[PDB]
């Protein structure tokens, strides 16, 4: 991994809000919000971090 910012995701629901607040993964994917990057991660055995804010 080539890092520098985790996603801070503390949701008490098993869902994400439908706001467009993009973050650029270190994988090169644009996540439509940080909660989406979180949920996507939790079914990964290796977490993508946040490369930059805004679309890649």
């Amino acid at each position: 991994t080539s890092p520098q910012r985790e996603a801070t995701c503390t949701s008490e629901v098993s869902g994400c809000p439908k706001i467009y607040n993009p973050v650029c993964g270190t994988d090169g994917i644009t996540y439509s919000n940080e909660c989406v990057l979180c949920s996507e991660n939790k079914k990964r055995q290796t977490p993508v971090l946040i490369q930059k804010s805004g679309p890649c």
């Binding site: 503390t10 008490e12 629901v13 869902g15 994400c16 439908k18 706001i19 467009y20 607040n21 439509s32």
Partner: protein, 225 residues
């Protein structure tokens, strides 16, 4: 589709639809009179510009209105952790000039029942590799689900201030960029786009703030501000 199972529609069709802009479109809203907009509380930011009469959010077609928000009032019991009371009021700096593409939506008098079909709108689009972004103005007709089936989809998560709408088989939903926008059932505002587990997934319908619970709060808040 790329429009999350919906169909394209224009600003004339949904003239109460607004865009909330902070350098880019992040949420929708609904116009409830010439000076006031209703959105989702999680859409709160400082320095929102409201964009009215938009057909394309990327192109200035010479018929839109750009108005700064003067005041944003988030429901005092909004809980960001549970998304309960996910409703915000926005006062515009000046009144909108109302026309065919810009008009306000009535507030409900009673709550809507399960199986009432509604119209959900917004600029939420989804690309190929499941990546959501705003662009094309789309519309979607969806039923309101029973409370049983909603709580069965999201066990422990659904409060008295939420409802589910959509299709248990998936394919058609609202998605990221649609937050805060309208769910209109027989000409009244019955919902605000709030959350979901992904978009258009099987057995995971969208979850909306139940606007009928809030009509007195909205009317008294507007009237005292």
């Amino acid at each position: 589709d790329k429009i999350v199972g919906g169909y394209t529609c224009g600003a004339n069709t949904v003239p109460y639809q607004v865009s909330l802009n902070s350098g880019y479109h992040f949420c929708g809203g609904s116009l409830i009179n010439s000076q006031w907009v209703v959105s989702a509380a999680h859409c709160y930011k400082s320095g929102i510009q409201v964009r009215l009469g938009e057909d394309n959010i990327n192109v200035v077609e010479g018929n839109e209105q750009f108005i700064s928000a003067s005041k944003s009032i988030v429901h005092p019991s909004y809980n960001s952790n549970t998304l309960n009371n996910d409703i915000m009021l926005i006062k515009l700096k000046s009144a909108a000039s109302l026309n065919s593409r810009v008009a306000s939506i009535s507030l409900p008098t009673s709550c809507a029942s399960a199986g009432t079909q509604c119209l959900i709108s917004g600029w939420g689009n989804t690309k190929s590799s499941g990546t959501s972004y705003p662009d094309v103005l789309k519309c979607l007709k969806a039923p309101i689900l029973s409370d049983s089936s909603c709580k069965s989809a999201y066990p422990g998560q659904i409060t008295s201030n939420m409802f589910c709408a959509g299709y248990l088989e998936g394919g058609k939903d609202s998605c990221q960029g649609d937050s805060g926008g309208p769910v209109v059932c027989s000409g009244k505002l019955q919902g605000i786009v709030s959350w979901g587990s992904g978009c258009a997934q099987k057995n995971k319908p969208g979850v909306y703030t139940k606007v009928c619970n809030y009509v007195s709060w909205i009317k008294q808040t507007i009237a005292s501000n």
